[PDB]
Structure 1
């Protein structure tokens, strides 16, 4: 949520380095890790003010975060863990419905097709 709010324009490698650091400090399982990434992205999209910030948050969740996950996969059985995290997330229907009301469309469909495109 900090990288979304302050530096959208930062490079993904610094963010991947920081996230791998945090995963090594407190020993975080991969499904809970990717779940916290998606939950943070969606919560920050819902709480965004209307205007440019909402466009910036949609870009961060839709484009930057999928690229960050790809770099984590190279650095690290990632597909099973991200699929587990997606089922973890799909239990949370009120978050996804609040997001869908702000997205004016089902945003989880676009997420799943985008993560399919990235592999």
Structure 2
């Protein structure tokens, strides 16, 4: 919803909502990060047809400043996004056919994903 309906408003409204739903539910950092990444990758694949993918990719690369701000603010001194992010990536990299279809949609997203992964090395 935050991706399709809107694109602006990034002070921390989506951050606040994600935190709030994180409190009152099962809140593992691995599961939370896999969930945000799965919602980030299920878009850009089935939703866009033409010029919408150019916005889906901008959303996928705006998602990581959001998770960076979240790591800076939400978590502090308890698995400081060094171990849990890796566990979630392993929790994500296990599902290969999803990433295969994602690369097949853009037809060049394999190397693009390789760059987006080292792009997420800011956190």
Band the TM-score falls in, shorter-chain normalisation: 0.7 to 0.9
CA distance in 2: counterparts of 1:111 and 1:8, whole angstroms: 25
Aligned residues: 118
CA distance in 2: counterparts of 1:59 and 1:50, whole angstroms: 15
The verdict on how the C-alpha distance between 1:78 and 1:9 changes in structure 2, with shifts beyond 3 A counting, is same
When Rg is computed on C-alpha atoms for both structures, the one with the higher figure is 2
Q: Deviations over 1:25-68 (max 9, x none)?
A: 11310000000111111111211222221111111112334433
TM-score, scaled relative to structure 2: 0.80
Match of 1:104 among 95, 99, 107: 107
Map 1:1-119 to 2 at 5 A: 2-75=1-74, 77-107=80-110, 110=113, 113=116, 116=119, 119=122
Question: Once structures 1 and 2 are overlaid, which stretch shifts more, 5-14 or 21-30?
Answer: 5-14
Question: Once structures 1 and 2 are overlaid, which stretch shifts more, 55-64 or 15-24?
Answer: 55-64
* Root-mean-square deviation over aligned CA pairs: 2.4
The verdict on how the C-alpha distance between 1:104 and 1:114 changes in structure 2, with shifts beyond 3 A counting, is same
Could you tell me which runs of 5 or more consecutive residues in structure 2 were left unpaired when the two chains were aligned. none
How many Å apart are 1:77 and its aligned residue? Answer: 2.0
CA distance in 1: counterparts of 2:4 and 2:14, whole angstroms: 13
CA distance in 2: counterparts of 1:108 and 1:37, whole angstroms: 21
- After TM superposition, which residue ranges in structure 1, 4 or more long, deviate above 6 angstroms? none
CA distance in 1: counterparts of 2:121 and 2:11, whole angstroms: 15
The verdict on how the C-alpha distance between 1:4 and 1:115 changes in structure 2, with shifts beyond 3 A counting, is farther
Structure with the higher helix share, 1 or 2: 1
Could you tell me which runs of 5 or more consecutive residues in structure 1 were left unpaired when the two chains were aligned. none
